[PDB]
Amino acid sequence: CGVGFIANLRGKPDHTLVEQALKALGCMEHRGGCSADNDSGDGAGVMTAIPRELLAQWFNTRNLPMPDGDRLGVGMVFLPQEPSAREVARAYVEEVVRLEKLTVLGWREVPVNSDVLGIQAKNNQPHIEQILVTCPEGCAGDELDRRLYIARSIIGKKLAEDFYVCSFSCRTIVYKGMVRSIILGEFYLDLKNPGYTSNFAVYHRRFSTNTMPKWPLAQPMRLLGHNGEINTLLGNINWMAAREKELEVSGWTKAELEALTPIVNQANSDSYNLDSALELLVRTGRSPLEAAMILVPEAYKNQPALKDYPEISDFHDYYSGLQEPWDGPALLVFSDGKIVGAGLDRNGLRPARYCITKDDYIVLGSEAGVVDLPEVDIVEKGRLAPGQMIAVDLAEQKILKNYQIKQQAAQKYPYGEWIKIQRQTVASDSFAEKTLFNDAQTVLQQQAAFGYTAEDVEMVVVPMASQGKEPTFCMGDDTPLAVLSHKPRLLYDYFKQRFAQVTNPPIDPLRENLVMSLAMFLGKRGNLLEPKAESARTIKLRSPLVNEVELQAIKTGQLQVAEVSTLYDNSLEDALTNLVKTAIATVQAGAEILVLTDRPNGAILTENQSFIPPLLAVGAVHHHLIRAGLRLKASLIVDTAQCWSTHHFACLVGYGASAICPYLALESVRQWWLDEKTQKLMENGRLIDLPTALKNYRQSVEAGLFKILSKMGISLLASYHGAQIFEAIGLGAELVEYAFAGTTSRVGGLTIADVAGEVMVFHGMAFKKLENFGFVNYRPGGEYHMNSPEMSKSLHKAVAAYDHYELYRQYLKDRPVTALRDLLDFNADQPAISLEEVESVESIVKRFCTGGMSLGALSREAHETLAIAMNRLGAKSNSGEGGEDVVRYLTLDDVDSEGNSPTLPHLHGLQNGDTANSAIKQIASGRFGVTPEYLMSGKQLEIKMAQGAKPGEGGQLPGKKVSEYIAMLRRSKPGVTLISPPPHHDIYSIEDLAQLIYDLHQINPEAQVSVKLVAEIGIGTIAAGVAKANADIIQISGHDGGTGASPLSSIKHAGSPWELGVTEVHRVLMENQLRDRVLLRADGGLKTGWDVVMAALMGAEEYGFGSIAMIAEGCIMARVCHTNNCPVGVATQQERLRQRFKGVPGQVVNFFYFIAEEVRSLLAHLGYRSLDDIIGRTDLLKVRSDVQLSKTQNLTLDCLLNLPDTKQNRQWLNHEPVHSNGPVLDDDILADPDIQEAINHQTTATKTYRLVNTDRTVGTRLSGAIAKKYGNNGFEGNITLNFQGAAGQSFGAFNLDGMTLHLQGEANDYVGKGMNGGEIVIVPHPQASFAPEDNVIIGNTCLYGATGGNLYANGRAGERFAVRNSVGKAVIEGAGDHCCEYMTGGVIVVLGPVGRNVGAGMTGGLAYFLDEVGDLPEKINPEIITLQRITASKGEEQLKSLITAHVEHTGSPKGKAILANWSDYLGKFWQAVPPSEKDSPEANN
């Protein structure tokens, strides 16, 4: 999406402004999307003032006196096409106006030209007319629009796509539709009419994840245009709906408030909802600015910029008890008709750039160079920083900046005073050290009864207590889905966490913690629309985990509080109805805190009792409070024995709990600590006192929640609280709809009676030590695991001799039900053909992929051997996210007769045609060794959004594993842990992904780009977006897949089966006509030709293998990959261990033959000759006739079997060989004979070009041609390329040595993304009417992943400057937040003010900051870097020399002045120094 506004504060309204708005819209075209016809637009529109000169004709035609400016109401109405339905609608619109006691003047037909629409938009088109209205009593302005709003809502109870009021206002009007940008004004004749005039325009071009256009869903909506995605929508909607019955505001009657009722609706888009909820807040007394400060509040805590504005802190402090954020990426552009403004989400995940002239003319938008204004007139170029707003007061003719706007709102009420008097704060640093139970067997028995298992305490609780963090582990979740297990499991295990991918980003819970909060509020949620001291009478918890001391203080507190039991003597089903009824009645009696205890009156669980599992209890009370209209009266505390893991807490808050007392878990820690075995081990060298174990355990939980919220990009637990950021697998419909309403659950599992049967299994075990199941590690007693040490061994043997493949196959076939595919079997429609007729192994093998395992997680022996193997086969390997040694790009020459090569001496089993070049080069959030030559060496390029083991998160390589070798490849520091950021800092939305894919197709026009997703509900939709974004291939990873290190909780509770994933993507693509755009690839636990065929039938065209491939080359399933101790040399970097690796490429060539030969024999059974014939043939599947579940009668597999008929139509299998970027500026640069000469003869050349914002990634196709011929450093020539104007995204991305790029103007985001060499210079027009150092000239995430090169910019940057810089050098003149965020080397100089969170995660390299204000120490992330004054002469001279070069390239008056007064300013620099540069000559002496 693209969004913006233009305002003319000082002049008469004109047509010129409207033209500029159409043209800016034109400039955002590449941010938009189109329907299946490739013609109709996903949406565009414009909001303007009511066009008074245009409607003066309508009155003149009727011989009618025109009402004055604020007295004419105009409704832009979408009406039905059918003649009689249209008149019914017209009459009804007339009717509700009459009943609101206003006067209908008549209707204006909207002049339109339909012949310009695309065929889908033409078929959907509503009939468009405007109704004109006045008030007979005298109504005007605020009161009129307030009555118009009441009237529009009423009409809106009959909302259809056919019947929709775009705007009903005496000040604003919205022209929108399902069109491309430059079609908007061709379709709406009024917009080209020189009588259409306006002092402002808000504009929007929409990008949607679908093919089917709906005119109402274009933007702007009534008040606002929205670029972004709400990521807590279900929660935000449930809370808001609960408030609707009981709306109350002075100078509103009840009837007027009821007329608005459907305020919120889970069936309208997230934007339609936010708009509607926002207008409620405006029409009832607040400016749009204030309303947006409530719905989408700033990250105000520990904001140093707020030091001087405590009323602003007070404002948010108050409201954060009343209203949770509508979170996720957001640029909002809004207009009242009185004010026109914009504001950013709390983390600023969309760009907003603005521009101000000498006449206070202002242009804001997603991109900078988009309205052409004479540059000499520009007096300021700025940007919005995270959470910031800017507005225009149209009447007063004033530009309002961030702090004024916000102070004007905060100071309206003594919010601080109210909090100080009314809020009770409940926090205790100290625990209860004294035990709950006294004897020994009691805690054991209770633990057994509440579902604890030996691995729960030993592998989850204990590490949390002892180490102060949730456990790290490795490999994938190898065991059965909870619903398929014969092993007892808790209700929690049926729930899979959801996570962000593509359409919105994860956030970094560690580097960007400062923006997140675990704070919660207990009690009556107060009146949102009318601020009162009362609303602040609440109990604030600093964290959802409440200890024993804290709970007593709550119970002692200033609120009414009621114990409600979850125990019962009768059936869970009825036990739960009495529960729900007791809650309802208890709140209706006046209680403000309900404590659902499974230990009522202090008493313990006996054998004569059972319980309602706490997730079911709270799910149930939350939704029934809601259904009874009572959820705002009370908060839920869960006092429960059955909560211990990080996942458990997340489900609880997520399904309605404000807080949890995990009393048995706290006791489990107390009894773990007390206990002579544990004491014996703390005395001889396992690690701690008891208050610390307790403190550590709480710290683990809290860190674990930060992690989980962040996988979805959510900052505040308060937002997560409503929302139900889960998919359920194995829960039947009655249950879901009972306790978990709105959760998807696709496969129909358990009834309420079945969950009882499961608690009773645990009850049977309770009424010696806890039982150990094989959950985490294989056991002979234990749960099934598909990768077991013996399966491995026998496979390793079968591969070793060119029968042993039998035991391996049978160990895999004597399996209990494990995955969804196991419930399936074949049902052939042809008779079986001979095996000789089936396509050859060599033909099948071309579809296999080896899967992207980082060079750090694996050894270069393991990693290279797979590449050679896969290249021999004619298939593909994937260099995962650790970059790749250049030595590997060349075919091997020097293989001797024993099959050794001095080029690759650590490998064995080689022949002369081999190459260890990975056919797939991966691009991941760390960008580790991501180089133009690395990019040119791929046949394919893969953008990794997520992997099955840890979808919400970034890659993870422990410091033990970062050898000198790994550090060299990644351009990082040797001993240092690498936790990659969870988002690509490049991809905060679908249109950002389109831009990354563009950059890849730019550098390497012949390479396919793939996008790697993880299976979860919503992947269908996301994948439609990815295809529209021009990808070639979509990978689907199952929850299943391996890893060299992930959180154990992530391995076990995040992500869904790939069966649900492939299927969902295949269907959505097909039913949207997008299926031929992409090749689909699948992975996650694939081992077997059988697996291959299942995947094929469900719609996969290629097949990925990770863990299995490691097993072929010698992996056992020792499962210490995260440890550096791999006993067999596959997943370690210790040299002496690498030396154990026996392993030759042939062994893995052999493995893929067994697979392919099994494919052939399954193709024989079915009677088809090639996978090409069966891909997507779902009607060839059936439900296995012999299976019997432990936990429910059976599942329901309709969602896996009901795919669209594929017997006849097979054209979707034909793909374009590579998608083009279209005609690009760089092509004209390369077709120039002076340029071709410069490249061929390594001579000098020079060219100059005018640019516009649609000119994106300039330079980069020329880098790619250079690196193709010479790699990164062979080019001895010199090309200067001079540009004038506003550069689009990724200017100078992947720059090489020998490239000088000069830009006179400004640039949008991602300047010098992956820069590797050469020089980028960016200066303002010499004409400029401003001090260059005070003004923005480049955008966000410049030098992302930079690996070399020099950048000089005579202006300010945005956020994440030099985000993950490895070797880049730069001098800029100011920046936003998160400067040098994951920097590992290079040098960054910033000659002006800088935002907060500097050097977060900064682990190597040095930065210099000029600080004239004195407050930079306030703005540093203090976790790694130290700040010091410059004292080392070598550092002084590093700085000078960089500033000296800025000046030579740039002419920067700020640099000159600095050099001229060198000693005056030296002492004003701070140097940022990570503890890895501390003894560098530039930091020390």
Ligand SMILES: Cc1cc2nc3c(=O)[nH]c(=O)nc-3n(C[C@H](O)[C@H](O)[C@H](O)COP(=O)(O)O)c2cc1C
């Ligand atoms: C040792 C290990 C390291 C991996 N590292 C990466 C990574 O660098 N990049 C990535 O996209 N996936 C990574 N993963 C995920 C795999 O690429 C692949 O998606 C997954 O292993 C397939 O599931 P499977 O292990 O059951 O075959 C890795 C997997 C393992 C086993």
Ligand SMILES: *CC(=O)CC[C@H](N)C(=O)O
């Ligand atoms: C492109 C964009 O930011 C989408 C906005 C909103 N979610 C929608 O229109 O679907």
Ligand SMILES: O=C(O)CCC(=O)C(=O)O
């Ligand atoms: O090497 C890395 O940085 C990450 C590899 C990884 O995330 C994994 O082992 O799953």
Ligand code: F3S
């Ligand atoms: S599990 Fe990992 S630790 Fe080694 S044996 Fe396999 S690579």
